[PDB]
Design a protein around this ligand. Structure first.
Ligand code: MG
Ligand code: MG
Ligand code: MG
Ligand code: MG
Ligand code: MG
Ligand code: MG
Ligand code: MG
Ligand code: MG
Ligand code: MG
Ligand code: MG
Ligand code: MG
Ligand code: MG
Ligand code: MG
Ligand code: MG
Ligand code: MG
Ligand code: MG
Ligand code: MG
Ligand code: MG
Ligand code: MG
Lengths: 145, 53, 104, 187, 141, 141
RNA sequence: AACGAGACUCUGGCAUGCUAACUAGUUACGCGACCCCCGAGCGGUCGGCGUCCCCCAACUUCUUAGAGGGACAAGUGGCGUUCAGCCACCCGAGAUUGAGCAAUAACAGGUCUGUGAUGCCCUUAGAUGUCGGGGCUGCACGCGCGCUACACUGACUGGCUCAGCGUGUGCCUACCCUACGCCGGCAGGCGCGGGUAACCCGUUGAACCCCAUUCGUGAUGGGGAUCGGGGAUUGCAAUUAUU
């Protein structure tokens, strides 16, 4: 049964062909599993066929939905980036847009040296956690002199 | 003289204090006692509470 | 004229409450007033549990204080004057009695 | 038929016990026939009262173990039901007799106590025989199915089978004879 | 036969298959992009979940004729796993429970009773017991 | 000249009251056939009195049952104890005495607590430990 | 002879015996109404489902809570210097329910930071008796009580069906538990009633469990730390992120 090609290289990442298509495309960053089901539902695709059982034209139908979600009627409260701080847009950053958007956000913070920027710099915990008995990476110290 | 002699004390531990010892820190609000946890063991009888459990 | 009228009794000591109730029943049935017997509402128990120690030292013992509340009702079918009269009599100890206009 | 009872399906009256030592301590026939391995059963109130408990219920109780099963008994009954249904296929024989066989051939008839590592050899009471056999063959199953695709009913079934005919491929038998050799040495 | 005479799961499947055989019973637009409660972690598998949910809702109204939305969300509550903290009981979604009860009034099966709440119309109970008999006759119950 | 009787059964604060009367068959509980009480893994438990006594005794009585309290399993034993505690008091009142001695010995020899309630109830927690007998950990050094 | 033990007080287990209940019910029918034939019948009648509506019907089994009753090693058989008692068994709701209370003499135990209980010492207007801001949360490291997990005796998605102890509008103080309708995916918002409480939330539709679907031995859909972005509620104020 269905012995044609399985693995597919969706943008910049190797989507394995074996897993169910829902749990197949999650190997993309910025695309969790709750977002993926919506994308596939709005793409009309069956949800009982692996990644190997999709031809070369459905996959474009899915990509264009992942990239332009606002227009395929996926509401504005699903998108991971909202009222984007620099320009007011709403969208899902996908693969390296996620890396660069985190990078730019940390740079934006450090630039005006906000209390979070310095915590990202010093490599500490940024939210309000106690730090006396947690994290605890370093090496043991001795009382001897 | 002064118009700055208080700032809102309308909830939390600043609001309330024991009806006997005037302390804060560990008072019983249940049933409207409003009584310090040490002061209540002292009058726990005259109110009527009796230990028999 | 003849009215329904309900007396509600509350206390914490049971014997006073029960003896009060039985005496009111007596005084009502000596006039043949068609009394509906005492209904015993569920007793209530107030619980307060605190550390024994004044400061923070010791093994961690607790007290378990509790107070009990008993409550019952009796119902009468009669004019008001006889009931407010006999109610007004024969209560020596510490017991709470409240009588209302009508409850039926 | 109505004088006779089944676990829905399986008959009791065709069973046999060949160890005359264990005839007092395995309950299966007659007044110990019950429809289900689930009774309230205040057994653990006196000393020997545990001997009256129907053997299939004892096999169920000893199965809900290791923490995230404490109490869940209806799962255990639905496990045992399935295990017997598989056993009737893998052999074509009565499941109850296979259980009775696998209990009889797992009780270590000699153990070594500790006195000082210095041990001594002693013989085990007829009640401890069954109390150990049950433990061993329920641990074999729970152990064989911890990260495998097999299901606990499948492993419990093949465990009962490979033990009812002492085969050195079953956890129970290995551990029993290994507990006996250590006694044999420091006799 | 009434509804209490028959197994309460295949009855639900029959009622759902019947409700989704009339073209009536308008479903909300967001039917395919909704978690269904605060404590779930995924959207329902069954693409027709609204039909099943409306079927079960009607059955529940049959057995206890005075529900209202504030208990449909309790009848449907479940257990929330708060990450690294102990779980806790959590309610359903108010909005879908409301839109389900509204969709049933359009079939004249439900009406807002005295006091406040909802109950089945006389015509709703017939629609139920008919497929109850249908179930009992299919499976021979 | 009505001919009826009522008796209860308890198991861990789960009371089930059975009312048996003149009739023909028809043993129900909360309105369902006893074939369909929910935890159906335990079905042979609540079929035990009829499967043990034979449907010849369950031939002139109709026995309805109302249950409330406890948990799922602790109500199977309430029911299972109440109906058999009933067929033994409908006999003892409207039949001869020596016929009920047959029922009681077919019953009590198979499984007690089809007539005598378990006296076990939960023990009460104490300060110091999580439950009734355990205690919190003790860190010496 | 006195204290401690025991006795005692509360609680759990049994009463189809008593007392008696629209702020608990049940059974009946006076009912009537709805619905299906689901069975005789036809569809009514015979019946079946009802937390549908009634009764100025009958009663107290279920509910509530008062007075008494019951268990005494009392009966039977062994072991006991035939004593004090132990062991097994019968009848039984039960032959060992769980707590509270507790002696003499002490400890350099803890507490002056519970007290308008308190001796002595100190400070007392440039205060050690008030407002604004920060800290008690600061992190190379050592320890203690814990929570969630390492999965198939499982995770996810639907479906089905069961509790018990409780608290509830606040006397300065100023806030309570929530039904039902509507709006919003969600947290939440608006509207309009009940409750000073066996009366309303509430027949407290609790989770595990139970039944059916997807996954497949792979750090995988196990696990859910850390981190980015956005939306609400509390408050005078949320940044070191309250929730
Ligand atoms: Mg109560
Ligand atoms: Mg867990
Ligand atoms: Mg516990
Ligand atoms: Mg006692
Ligand atoms: Mg009681
Ligand atoms: Mg009712
Ligand atoms: Mg008494
Ligand atoms: Mg003697
Ligand atoms: Mg007996
Ligand atoms: Mg005692
Ligand atoms: Mg002492
Ligand atoms: Mg002091
Ligand atoms: Mg001093
Ligand atoms: Mg001051
Ligand atoms: Mg300050
Ligand atoms: Mg601190
Ligand atoms: Mg400690
Ligand atoms: Mg689930
Ligand atoms: Mg805080």
């Amino acid at each position: 049964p269905e012995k044609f090609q399985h693995i597919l290289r969706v943008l910049n990442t190797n989507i394995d062909g074996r897993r169910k298509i829902a749990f197949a495309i999650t190997a993309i960053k910025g695309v969790g599993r709750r977002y993926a089901h919506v994308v596939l539902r709005k793409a009309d695709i069956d949800l009982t066929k692996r990644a190997g059982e999709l031809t070369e034209d459905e996959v474009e139908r899915v990509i264009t939905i992942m990239q332009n979600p606002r227009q395929y009627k996926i509401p504005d409260w699903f998108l991971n980036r909202q009222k984007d701080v620099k320009d007011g847009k709403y969208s899902q950053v996908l693969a390296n847009g996620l890396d660069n958007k985190l990078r730019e956000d940390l740079e934006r913070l450090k630039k005006i040296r906000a209390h979070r920027g310095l915590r990202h710099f010093w490599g500490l915990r940024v939210r309000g956690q106690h730090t006396k008995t947690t994290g605890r990476r370093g090496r043991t110290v001795g009382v001897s002199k | 003289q002064q118009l700055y002699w208080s700032h809102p004390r309308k909830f939390g531990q600043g609001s309330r204090s024991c009806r006997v010892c005037s302390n804060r820190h560990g008072l019983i609000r249940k049933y409207g006692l409003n009584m310090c946890r040490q002061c209540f063991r002292q009058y726990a009888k005259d109110i009527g509470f009796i230990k028999l459990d | 004229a003849i009215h329904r009228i309900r007396i509600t009794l509350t206390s914490r000591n049971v014997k006073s409450l029960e003896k009060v109730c039985a005496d009111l029943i007596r005084g009502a049935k000596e006039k043949n007033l068609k009394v509906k017997g005492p209904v015993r509402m569920p007793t209530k128990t107030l619980r307060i549990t605190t550390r024994k120690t004044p400061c923070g030292e010791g093994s961690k013992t607790w007290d378990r204080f509790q107070m009990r509340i008993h409550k019952r009702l009796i119902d009468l079918h009669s004019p008001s004057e006889i009931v407010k009269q006999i109610t007004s009599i024969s209560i020596e100890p510490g017991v709470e009695v409240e009588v209302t206009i009508a409850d039926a | 038929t109505p004088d006779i009872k089944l676990f829905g399906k399986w008959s009791t009256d065709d069973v046999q016990i060949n160890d005359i030592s264990l005839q007092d301590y395995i309950a299966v026939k007659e007044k110990y026939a019950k429809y289900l391995p689930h009774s309230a059963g205040r057994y653990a109130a006196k000393r020997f009262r545990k001997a009256q408990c129907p053997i299939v219920e004892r096999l169920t109780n000893s199965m809900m173990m290791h923490g995230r099963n404490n109490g869940k008994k209806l799962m255990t009954v639905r496990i045992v039901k399935h295990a017997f249904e598989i056993i009737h296929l893998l052999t074509g024989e009565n499941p109850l007799q296979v259980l009775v066989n696998a209990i009889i051939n797992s009780g270590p008839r000699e153990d070594s106590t500790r006195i000082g590592v210095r041990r001594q050899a002693v013989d085990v009471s007829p009640l401890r025989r069954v109390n150990q056999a049950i433990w061993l063959l329920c641990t074999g199953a729970r152990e064989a199915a911890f990260r495998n695709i097999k299901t606990i009913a499948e492993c419990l079934a093949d465990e009962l089978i490979n033990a009812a005919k002492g085969s050195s491929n079953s956890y129970a038998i290995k551990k029993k004879d290994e507990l006996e050799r250590v006694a044999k040495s420091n006799r | 036969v009434t509804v209490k005479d028959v197994n309460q799961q295949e009855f639900v499947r029959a009622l759902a298959a019947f409700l989704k055989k009339s073209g009536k019973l308008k479903v909300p637009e967001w039917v395919d992009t909704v978690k269904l409660a605060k404590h779930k972690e995924l959207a329902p598998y069954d693409e027709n979940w609204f039909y099943t949910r409306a079927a079960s809702t009607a059955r529940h109204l049959y057995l206890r004729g005075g529900a209202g939305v504030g208990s449909m969300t309790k009848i449907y509550g479940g257990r929330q796993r708060n990450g690294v903290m102990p779980s806790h009981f959590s309610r359903g979604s108010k909005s879908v429970a409301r839109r389900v009860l509204q969709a049933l009034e359009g079939l004249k099966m439900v009406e807002k009773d005295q006091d406040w709440g909802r109950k089945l119309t006389p015509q709703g109970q017939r629609d139920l017991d008919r497929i109850a008999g249908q179930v009992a006759a299919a499976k021979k119950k | 000249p009505l001919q009826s009787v009522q008796v209860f059964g308890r198991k861990k604060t789960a009371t089930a009251v059975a009312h048996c009367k003149r009739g023909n068959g028809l043993i129900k509980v909360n309105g369902r056939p006893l074939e369909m009480i929910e935890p159906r893994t335990l079905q042979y438990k609540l079929l035990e009195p009829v499967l043990l006594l034979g449907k010849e005794r369950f031939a002139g009585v109709d026995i309805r049952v109302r249950v409330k309290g406890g948990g799922h399993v602790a109500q199977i034993y309430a029911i299972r104890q109440s109906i058999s505690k009933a067929l033994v008091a409908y006999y003892q009142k409207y039949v001869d005495e020596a016929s009920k001695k047959e029922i009681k010995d077919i019953l009590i020899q198979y499984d007690r607590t089809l007539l005598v309630a378990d006296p076990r109830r939960c023990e009460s927690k104490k300060f110091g430990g999580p439950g009734a007998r355990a205690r919190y950990q003790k860190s010496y050094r």
